[PDB]
Amino acid sequence: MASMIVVFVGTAGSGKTTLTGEFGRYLEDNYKVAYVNLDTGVKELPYEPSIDVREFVTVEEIMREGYGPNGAIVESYDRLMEKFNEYLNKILRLEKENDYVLIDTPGQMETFLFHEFGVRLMENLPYPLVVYISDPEILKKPNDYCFVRFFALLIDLRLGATTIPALNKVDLLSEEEKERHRKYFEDIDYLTARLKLDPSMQGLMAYKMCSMMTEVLPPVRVLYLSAKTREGFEDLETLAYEHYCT
Amino acid sequence: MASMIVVFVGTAGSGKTTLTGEFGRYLEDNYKVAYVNLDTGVKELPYEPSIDVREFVTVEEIMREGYGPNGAIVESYDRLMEKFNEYLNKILRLEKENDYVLIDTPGQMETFLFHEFGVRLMENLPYPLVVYISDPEILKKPNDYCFVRFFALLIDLRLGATTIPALNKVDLLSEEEKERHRKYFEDIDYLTARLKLDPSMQGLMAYKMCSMMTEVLPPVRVLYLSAKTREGFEDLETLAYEHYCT
Ligand SMILES: Nc1nc2c(ncn2[C@@H]2O[C@H](COP(=O)(O)OP(=O)(O)O)[C@@H](O)[C@H]2O)c(=O)[nH]1
Ligand SMILES: Nc1nc2c(ncn2[C@@H]2O[C@H](COP(=O)(O)OP(=O)(O)O)[C@@H](O)[C@H]2O)c(=O)[nH]1
Ligand SMILES: [Mg+2]
């Protein structure tokens, strides 16, 4: 009815499948929800998918053809393209009968960013919203913050869909960490400022870069989520609905 | 002696291992050369590596512990971190006894961009040069060009190493294709110009972005290489040496 699509994008250990699971249940209180799994090499799902590409191809079976692991992943998404139109249509249909279609993407994001299947699928859905989750562990140095927010800018460019930067597993944060990440993230002044202290080509090649005063809506609002405590779920829901309007 | 390190970074089908192989042989005419393989899930190497992390861990063996393919790749680079110092030192030593250390990276670049092993290793080598190869197939639309050159900008930010944008397998190009890619790439005027024709949020969110007039050395020189004809090898060699100076 409301027909929103939310695509979770992240690398290994970001926890996006658990998030897709739990954020669904959260939504299943006030909304009809659909689950789509595009990962051909995930062992188990904590939700019940209306679409599961493992039903057509899996990485493990393909490897049992003599493919290397890197080669079976790529080859698994080559075979999916034979069922491109089907899935696009499976998805478009689901989107007509639901408030939310949650799309769980390949564990290796480059399989989604670089392969025809993921790229073309995206191109052909109406205004999908993308949520890019990062493992807060990566957030050790000041450049790490600029990168996260640049990567989300690309995903946007590559998939042509608004992309929301998010940290997940924030329940594991000491709260000092919690303190530290927000500062760099929300206080654009703080971040840029700090980037000068680096006397290095990367402290120097990395400062002119966080040009917030650029683009349009230069700065993006970073969500902090937790599958575990349902932190930030209402923000995301508010962000979905609001993207659906604008 | 000259001690240069060249790190090949690219996704599946970009051909970087074949490139690392052949560009070595090309160098093995006028130089001493070392090969380092950081990919724990590659089936076979066309070169003789002085360092091979498959000798310590492989993705396939790890999966035979009940790990999913996505989970065995990540777990393979977690175990490598136990031998971090060793490899750093293996590498630093090789770099002292050779003109060139060629570093062949994990087939999935995010394993290199997001995992501690790849990120920390990079941080700890002297001014390595990174070569980001893309499959020219991805080069279908005008935004595809901006993205390639943005991704290389990140790799730079993430790894803190100068990153050279390259197309590979250019021998497969019809020459019309060859015509088309260079125009978008080298003629900065052409590219930006074209990006306006898009009346879309992505033709609109994708134009203010290719800000060449920004950064420092805003525009980067894109190499066109071929393992097959040795196209562009002299450019790269010229680019290595020149990065070694500057
Ligand atoms: N503490 C905590 N753990 C989480 C959270 N989200 C996921 N996890 C755990 O992280 C691990 C990886 O999650 P998963 O969603 O399967 O990873 P994915 O491959 O990115 O989809 C699982 O053991 C989850 O239980 C979270 O918000 N908080
Ligand atoms: N025509 C052509 N084929 C190439 C070139 N480089 C690699 N290949 C082929 O592309 C395939 C994948 O190459 P490989 O280096 O193993 O892929 P990688 O996983 O990115 O390292 C192999 O069959 C190579 O023979 C090239 O420059 N030209
Ligand atoms: Mg998963």
Ligand SMILES: [Mg+2]
């Ligand atoms: Mg390879």
